[PDB]
Amino acid sequence: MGKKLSLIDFNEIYNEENLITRANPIENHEFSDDGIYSERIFGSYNEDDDDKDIDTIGWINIEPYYII
Amino acid sequence: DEWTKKILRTEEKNKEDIYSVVRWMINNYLALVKQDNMNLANKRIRLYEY
Amino acid sequence: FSARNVITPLIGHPIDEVAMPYKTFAELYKFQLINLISKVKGINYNEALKFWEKGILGFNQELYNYMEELITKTKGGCTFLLNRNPTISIGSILYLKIGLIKKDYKDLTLGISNNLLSALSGDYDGDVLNIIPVFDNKMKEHFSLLSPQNFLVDRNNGRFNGDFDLQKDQILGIFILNN
Amino acid sequence: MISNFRKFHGNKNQEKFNENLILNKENESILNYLDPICKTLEIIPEITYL
Amino acid sequence: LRYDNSVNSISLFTLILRYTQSGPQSPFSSNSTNNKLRGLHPSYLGRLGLTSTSAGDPGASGSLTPFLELPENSYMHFTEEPEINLN
Amino acid sequence: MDDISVIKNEDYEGSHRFLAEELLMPNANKTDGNRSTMFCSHLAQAVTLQKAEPPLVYTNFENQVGKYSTAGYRKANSNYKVIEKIYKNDYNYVLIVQDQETGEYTLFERAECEFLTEHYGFQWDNDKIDSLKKDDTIEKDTVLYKNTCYDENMNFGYGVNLNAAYFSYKNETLEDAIVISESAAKKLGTFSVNKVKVSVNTNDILLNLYGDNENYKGFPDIGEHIKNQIIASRRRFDYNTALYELKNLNEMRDSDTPFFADGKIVDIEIFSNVPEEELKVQKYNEQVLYYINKQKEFSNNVYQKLKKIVEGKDNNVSDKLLHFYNNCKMRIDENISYTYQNSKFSGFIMEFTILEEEPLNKGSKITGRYGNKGVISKILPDDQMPTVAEGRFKGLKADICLNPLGVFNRLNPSQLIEQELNWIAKFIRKDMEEAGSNEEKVSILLDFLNRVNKEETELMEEFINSLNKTELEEFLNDIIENGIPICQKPFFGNIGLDELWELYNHYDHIDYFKCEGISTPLIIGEIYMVRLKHEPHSKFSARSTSKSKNFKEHKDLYSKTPVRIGNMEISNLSLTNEMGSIMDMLNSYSNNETNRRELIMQLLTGNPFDTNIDLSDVESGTSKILKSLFTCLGLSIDDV
Amino acid sequence: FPKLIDSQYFIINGNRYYPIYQLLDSGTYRTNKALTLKTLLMPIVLREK
Amino acid sequence: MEKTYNLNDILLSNEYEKIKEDIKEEIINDMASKKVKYSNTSEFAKNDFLKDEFIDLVVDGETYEITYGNLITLLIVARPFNHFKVPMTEDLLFDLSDLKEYQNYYTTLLEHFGYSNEIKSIIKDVISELAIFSGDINVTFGNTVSIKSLIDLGNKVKRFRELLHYRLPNDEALEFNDIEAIIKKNLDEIMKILSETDNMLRYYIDSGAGINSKQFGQVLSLVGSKPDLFGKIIPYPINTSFLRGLDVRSFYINALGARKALITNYQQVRNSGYLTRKISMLLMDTKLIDLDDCGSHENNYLSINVENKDVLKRFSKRSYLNNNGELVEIDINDESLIGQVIKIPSPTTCASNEGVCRKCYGKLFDINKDLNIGMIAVLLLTDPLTQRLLSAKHLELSKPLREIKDLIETNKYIKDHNVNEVVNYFIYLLNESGINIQSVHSELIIREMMKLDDSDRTQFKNDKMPDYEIFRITDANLKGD
Ligand SMILES: [Zn+2]
């Protein structure tokens, strides 16, 4: 658990394009493009067409509020 | 219990009740502590008990 | 691309060369084998796999011929690494060549020279040795530094290593000859 | 022939295995051990082991 | 209980007359380092097998003698009386 | 205990009571404890032999070991009378008998093989029980079926006697290695029996591996051997409604599950949870249906025949008969839902019992009764083995050749004594054959045995005087050709240095054999040999890129369990000082999926005889997952 | 309770299991600072000081 | 057979293989034609074998009397000179009847032809051809073992009969040392009688193939006293041979040992091997530089005490400062250096940060350059230590192994002693334990354990010894940070 290693400033690396501000798991009987399971930013089963790896990381915005 | 009485190998006077067994053990404590663990005389084989 | 096999004594062949069972070579060099069958017979890779699957079941001369050609005609030979665990000594892992492929399906023992045994520290008591083939010619060259020939020299002394010298049966024959 | 002689010698060995030890599994009785285990229940006044 | 892992029809010593010190309630344990218990004792002669044991767990299991006589009326005790006479 | 003064030899003199498994070992006083404990281990590891023989040098307790080891023979326990015989298969059948005293009705079962565990099993000599017909009395101690270990007079044998010579054969007999004659290897033959379960559900069908287009047979028949090591293969279907896959019967694919074994199937037991009418419509079930019907036909047949006895008020039935009857009745009864592993299963589960004659092959381990070990390095023709020339024993060939170097180091001298005794016995046999009347032959025999074992001599004199002249001649011919029994008791009654010395001094004609191409004269004498369970097949592993337990479930021909590379292995490889190549091998063979795909693709698309692989530099999938999760954790590596 | 078949083994859940004898101490077994007699319920132990 | 053979004429001829073939064929055909005769006495029996007949071998004009068998052995082992077409000087000829010398001849072949891969290939072909012929000798001459062989000798040689039937005196005055003395006296005689008589076991005894002294004497003469489960020698000895039989009492003592061997192997399973990874980590990066002289001062050169003959052996192929001059290779054979502290260039003190020089490492530079030097050191130390620990459990013998570990893996001796004292303690620990390693490999391990307090790599050329601090193997890895 407790390790001494470099910390990361999330705000600089944060990407607005892959922002999950929609909480709906499904939208109108479909996986939400803004949902957690989003084919656009995270990828899908057809991963070779996506050219988007597991390294793809989503973001959530708490602005205008801060957490520890 | 009756099974330990049957297995035990001393005069029946010493196996009548728990008191007789304790008396027998205490009177022969020094001798009994000095007995070989591996001597087959002090051991047995069992099959159905377990 | 790994294997485990029992060791049996081999006579009449060079120290570095070994004899590998029919089943052992087929699996490790399967993709190389499928390449030749596809080229020779002009068939699809899936169809070539069907030929390989049929050969696995029992000894057939045709698949043996493809296997024999690979050991004969491959550049640098067909070579692998043989380790006896624990790998605690120099010579525990050795770079060796596949001289022959056995024609008995039942025979599943690797054939090694008695001189190699002392370096490996293993015994022909039913112990199993791990076989890891090396494919790239560059990788083959780098692992050739682990070959038995390079280990003829003892690294601490610079002298010849008795591990690769004549053993019990071998010494007696030369002794009767000379003494 | 040879086989008849071999059987004859085997029967005349004079060193014979203890059949009772080999077959003691059959001649051991479960009831002997079951009875005390059941009588441990007799500590309860209502329960009496028949 | 023990599965019949036998590869043979020979059963007199592999299964019929086999004994094990190890048990559910066993004085014998690997952690206890019962090296003495794994060894042989002079009483074993005529009752237990001196050379019959398994290399994996030496002394834990062995073969009973075919000629072993367990005294009648002693409840499968090797001897009618214990080691020390007490008389 | 420390005290060994309690042990007094006079107390244990003349008694083998202190011996257990070593009662099967001759001259056990001369063998070390280590070799004896190895022998005790080998006897349990010994495998059944089709052509097992009583040992030429015997301890005389062997027959008792055969008697009290009941797994090998079936003996009647009372006088019985055969009520009827019912057949399930040609190989498997049941015999119903009635006790001539109790009147109780019991049954005896006949099958070709006995399954013990894994592949281990043995075939049965079912001659007597097969001879029995209805209204035939079975006497009290008759042996209905016997193992190959027991002979006509129920003598017990766990090995074969093979002529052995200690000779250095082209260094092939190095350390504990053996060279065997092909004929001799024929003698050391084992059985393998396997019970294999193939489960076919509703969506699974069995391919027509053994059948043509007109007749659909997807698995072997009761009298037919397995071909290409494939019993059957099942193809699972997403929906079996279409039945469009009828044309697909001949072809095979990787997805199909193949079941592997070799041998003759001897019994099929099918447990079906599907109604008969549903099965009948499809032709692909045809073969299965037959055996299903056969099972029912067998079960019904017992039910009709025994219903009066079992369901009658008297009920003089053995528990075995009662339970057999109840199981068959359950089979014929409707609403019988079969459960395996406490769950109801779709389709049917089939158990095949397969018996194969497994011959001796290279890598097999064979031993003697004295703790020595040997591995079959080479099997060679009889002519290539040492053959003595220009003697009365001319053309005698050695069946096995053993390493001469280090023999005394083993501390098991007794093997040599066995060899010497059978070798000297060869001379005695030739002496009997060469000249004399029957009386001269018995005189030579009795003198030699008096030199070896007095008890055997006395008992042989009694046995011989009992024999009629024709029987005596037959016994003498048996001794001349087949061999001579010699008794070497484990501790008391064996011969020693002085006794063998006297034997050699008296028999001056007995001297080493001069072999055809061998300068050194050799001794060839029979040694008793046993076959051990170990074969190379147990530890064989071979893997090619795409435990699974499929091999244990008979779905794979051989284990594909990967070899493991560790820090020790990496260090020994790092001796080369070319770390990049080691990392390339690790990534291409295991860690890196992209590099692994490149290696496979290049191996199949490159030149067959020249292989050069170029691997891309990319982070592994594990590394990618690690970076993604760590960034979410809030910590990032700085390539510290 | 399992039933003996052929006088030396049991058949349960389709498998052949053989019962083997166990070697145990009869009674009054020695232990560190103690002498114990084993009973079905509670062992009777004598501890010394 | 011809009676005159010119060595370098056949070796430099293009009929080299054909000459060997026909001689090899002639020798084995002779052996198949005739039997070997045994007299079982000191006056050996006569045999007409070509291998034992004499030929004259001409080496650069000098004739040596050599047996036909020694000739075919010489040709097989002189394959290098046919391949390279360079003649064989008389310096290279060796005793062909003592197989111990073959090892040293291969060593001289490696030095003469430059430790090349080509000479490495030829030696492999020589070992191969020598072995294949041995099988032909063995399958034609034959080799056997028999108790009649023992009986046949004793019938002529009374001493064999008396030793084959020997039984200890029943004096209670005999003790474990007295019995063990009789064991060697009668066994040394037995081996001598077998070497000096025409018996079927003579070639075994002289060759050393398949002969272990203790186990040979137990079968033939006497077993002796045996330990119990916990090592105490049992008061009663076994006064028989396995060939003659054993007593019921003796049978229990043997079973005790065989059981003890089994229990010991169960305990032997322990194999921590933690140090192997630690030593490998520090030494994997150490490399070599093609620089003849790094530049170091003689006081900065390492000083070692040649107290024992074992000490000089560890420093072969390395430099030494002679009293008259400087920088001459130490000759291990000269016992003059025994008892003298000597100054040696050490891989510990090599100045260049990149690698160790050719004078500090030693003459093994060109020999071991292809492999990783640090990894060579870790395996030369690990494989004995791991094996010695296990072999000692069977028998103060175990103590050297522990102190070796404590020296490098703990700061007990590291924090209060100098490197000159540290390396000499290491060679003392190796000598007592029996580990045979050349000191260069042990010093390389100490070199990486040694971390400079001053933190300057090239300061070694300064006459003043650099300030430094040795570290524990695990701590030195931790100090990198
Ligand atoms: Zn330097």
For residue H248, give the H/E element and its range.
Answer: helix H248-267
Distance H352 CA to ligand 1 centre (A): 7
CA distances from C168 to C116, F230, F519 (A): 13, 45, 20
Contact by Cβ (8 Å): F46, F532: yes
Secondary structure class of H231 (helix, strand, coil): coil
CA distances from H88 to H93, H109, H132 (A): 8, 11, 24
What residues in B contact F1, CB-CB < 8 Å?
Answer: 36, 38-39
Angle, helix F414-434 to helix F469-481, in steps of 10 degrees = 130
Closest of E48, E51, E21 to residue E36, by C-alpha: E21
Q: Does D25 touch chain G if contact means CB atoms closer than 8 Å?
A: yes
Length of chain B counted residue by residue = 50
Enter the tokens of residue H382: 């690990």
Specify which residues F304 forms β-bridges with: none
**Cβ atoms within 10 Å, residue F315:** 11
Specify which residues F63 forms β-bridges with: none
Peptide bond into A64 cis (omega under 30): yes
β-pairing, C109-112 vs C3-9, is: parallel
Peptide bond into F275 cis (omega under 30): no
For residue F506, report the phi and psi dihedrals to the nearest 5 degrees: -65, -45
Distance H348 CA to ligand 1 centre (A): 7
Contact by Cβ (8 Å): H63, H57: yes
Nearest to B2 among D24, D30, D36 (CB): D36
Spatial separation of the C-alpha atoms in residues C142 and C93, rounded to whole Å: 13
Contact by Cβ (8 Å): H302, H421: no
- Contact between chains at D6 and F68 (C-beta distance less than 8 A): no
Contact by Cβ (8 Å): H383, H374: no
* B:E CB pairs within 8 Å: 62
Secondary structure class of F366 (helix, strand, coil): strand
Closest of H300, H302, H282, H303 to residue H454, by C-alpha: H300
- Cα of F418 vs its chain's centroid, Å: 26
What residues in H contact C141, CB-CB < 8 Å?
Answer: none
Spatial separation of the C-alpha atoms in residues F402 and H472, rounded to whole Å: 54
Closest of H357, H368, H372, H377 to residue H449, by C-alpha: H377
Q: What is the DSSP letter of F123?
A: E
Task: Kindly write down the DSSP assignment for every residue of H357-395, as one continuous string.
Answer: -HHHH-TTHHHHTTS-HHHHHHHHHHHHHHHHHHHHHH-
For residue F348, give the H/E element and its range.
Answer: strand F348-358
**Cβ atoms within 10 Å, residue F630:** 14
Enter the tokens of residue C150: 């390079």
Task: Kindly write down the DSSP assignment for every residue of F370-424, as one continuous string.
Answer: TS-EEEEEEEE-GGGS-BB-SSSS-S-B-SEEE--TTTGGGT-THHHHHHHHHHH
Q: Does C169 touch chain H if contact means CB atoms closer than 8 Å?
A: yes
- Contact between chains at D40 and G41 (C-beta distance less than 8 A): yes
Spatial separation of the C-alpha atoms in residues D7 and F485, rounded to whole Å: 12
Q: Is H474 exposed, middle or buried (0-12, 13-18, 19+ CB in 10 A)?
A: middle
The dihedral formed by the CA atoms of H3, H9, H15 and H20, expressed in degrees to the nearest 10: 50
The vertex-H156 CA angle with H150 and H157, nearest 5°, equals 75
Residues contacting residue F11 through CB under 8 Å, at least 6 positions apart: none
Task: Kindly write down the DSSP assignment for every residue of E9-55, as one continuous string.
Answer: S--IIIIITEEES--SS-S--TTTT-HHHHS--GGGTTTB-SS---S
Spatial separation of the C-alpha atoms in residues H257 and H237, rounded to whole Å: 13
CA distances from C60 to C74, C102, C109, F228 (A): 21, 12, 19, 11
**Searching chain F, which residue's CA lies closest to the CA of residue A4?**
F635
Residues contacting residue F583 through CB under 8 Å, at least 6 positions apart: none
- Contact between chains at F153 and D4 (C-beta distance less than 8 A): yes
- Cα of F474 vs its chain's centroid, Å: 35
Spatial separation of the C-alpha atoms in residues F320 and F331, rounded to whole Å: 17
Enter the tokens of residue C129: 């040795």
What residues in D contact F476, CB-CB < 8 Å?
Answer: none
CA distances from A38 to A63, E65, F626, H67, H188 (A): 22, 75, 21, 89, 88
Secondary structure class of A40 (helix, strand, coil): coil
F592, amino acid identity:
N
* A:F CB pairs within 8 Å: 31
Contact by Cβ (8 Å): H151, F504: yes
Spatial separation of the C-alpha atoms in residues F339 and F345, rounded to whole Å: 6
**Cβ atoms within 10 Å, residue F463:** 17
Distance H447 CA to ligand 1 centre (A): 11
Nearest to B44 among E23, E43, E76 (CB): E76
Enter the tokens of residue H116: 């090349």
For residue C110, report the phi and psi dihedrals to the nearest 5 degrees: -75, 135
Tokens 């601090």 belong to H469
CA distances from F620 to A55, F594, F595, F617, H247 (A): 11, 8, 9, 9, 69
The vertex-H315 CA angle with H310 and H318, nearest 5°, equals 160
Contact by Cβ (8 Å): H449, H476: yes
Q: What is the 3-state secondary structure (H, E, C) of chain C?
A: CCEEEEEEECCCCCCCEEEECHHHHHHHCHHHHHHHHHHHHCCCHHHHHHHHHHHHHCCCHHHHHHHHHHHHHCCCCCEEEEECCCCCCCCCEEEEEEEEECCCCCCCEEEECHHHHHHHCCCCCCCEEEEEEECCHHHHHHHHHHCCCHHHECCCCCCECHHHCCCHHHHHHHHHHHC
For residue F190, give the H/E element and its range.
Answer: strand F190-200
**Searching chain B, which residue's CA lies closest to the CA of residue D42?**
B1
Q: Which residues of H are annotated as a binding site for Zn(2+)?
A: 294, 350, 357, 360
Spatial separation of the C-alpha atoms in residues F433 and F237, rounded to whole Å: 74
Spatial separation of the C-alpha atoms in residues H288 and H279, rounded to whole Å: 18
Spatial separation of the C-alpha atoms in residues F550 and C45, rounded to whole Å: 25
Give the determination technique: X-ray
Contact by Cβ (8 Å): F379, F169: no
Spatial separation of the C-alpha atoms in residues F301 and A48, rounded to whole Å: 64
Work out whether the CA dihedral F437, F442, F445, F451 comes out positive or negative.
negative
Distance H330 CA to ligand 1 centre (A): 17
Resolution of this deposited model, Å: 3.3
Spatial separation of the C-alpha atoms in residues H99 and F517, rounded to whole Å: 27
- Contact between chains at B1 and D36 (C-beta distance less than 8 A): yes
